[model samples]
Target: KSFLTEQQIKILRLRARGLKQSEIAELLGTSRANISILERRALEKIEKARNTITIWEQINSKISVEVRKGEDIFTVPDKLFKKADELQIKVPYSTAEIIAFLVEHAPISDRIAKRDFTLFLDARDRLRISECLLEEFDE
Candidate 1:
């Protein structure tokens, strides 16, 4: 039994709307395999949750919430920075600038509580994508 993440639900909804795995991957900026795993996990959760309401509640409570404040600080881990460098990735902007761009361009949430459900998945399966924006933050 497990709780469905927002991204998982999004994939399921897109699939329900007759979208293909490749289409969903392109829409989400993720790989087709990622969408497949998310969809499978969601179906598994739904199947298990149907067995008992208590199990559903237990799983739902484990969702992770990610908060980014105006003054909050973030660092590019050394390994990540090195990997990006190894891949010939350029960093013309600072990490702060990148965060600002992410905040500005991210989708608006209907509720105040936004979560990062990927943390619940396996460490090996976990993937982090970081990029610096060429544009500066708007006032």
Candidate 2:
């Protein structure tokens, strides 16, 4: 099974805190169906999680660190990117955490325009936000 993404964990925490899926939807401005998927996936983490994580995690650890929101050093495949959109990808962590996904699963190349990357990162950052996010944007 794929390791849980940070966004998935956040939803799990919200549900764990006893928030209804409807409440989660209100908080995020998404539908309850969306929240349902997140809650389901988070619970899946326990049984679905394997003794070792998948290959995607290993590759991202080497290149860089401390990638703030609006910092886009990588890209996601189109389908995964859309799924990430539905889930709201605003949780923060060391690049060490998701390096495998970034390095191996990323569909983008270094040649993509930096400006585009920046825009994509900013949009993703705006969803299901937290205080740890950058206080200001550069572009």
Highest TM-score: give the candidate number: 1
Weakest 10 consecutive residues of candidate 1 by summed lDDT: 117-126
* Tens-digit lDDT string for candidate 1 (73-129): 233223334555676644444556544543553332432213221111112322222
State every prediction's TM-score relative to the real structure: 0.37, 0.33
lDDT value, residue 62 of candidate 1: 24
On a 0 to 1 TM-score scale, where does candidate 1 land against the true structure?
Answer: 0.37
Candidate closest to the true structure, highest lDDT: 1
lDDT of 2 by residue, 20-132 (tens): 98998898899999888877877777654531232123221222112333444443234334545476653343334344445443333552322221112322232111122
Error of 1 at 125 (Å): 44
Give Cα distance to truth, residue 125, candidate 2, Å.
45
In order, what lDDT does every prediction score? 0.49, 0.46
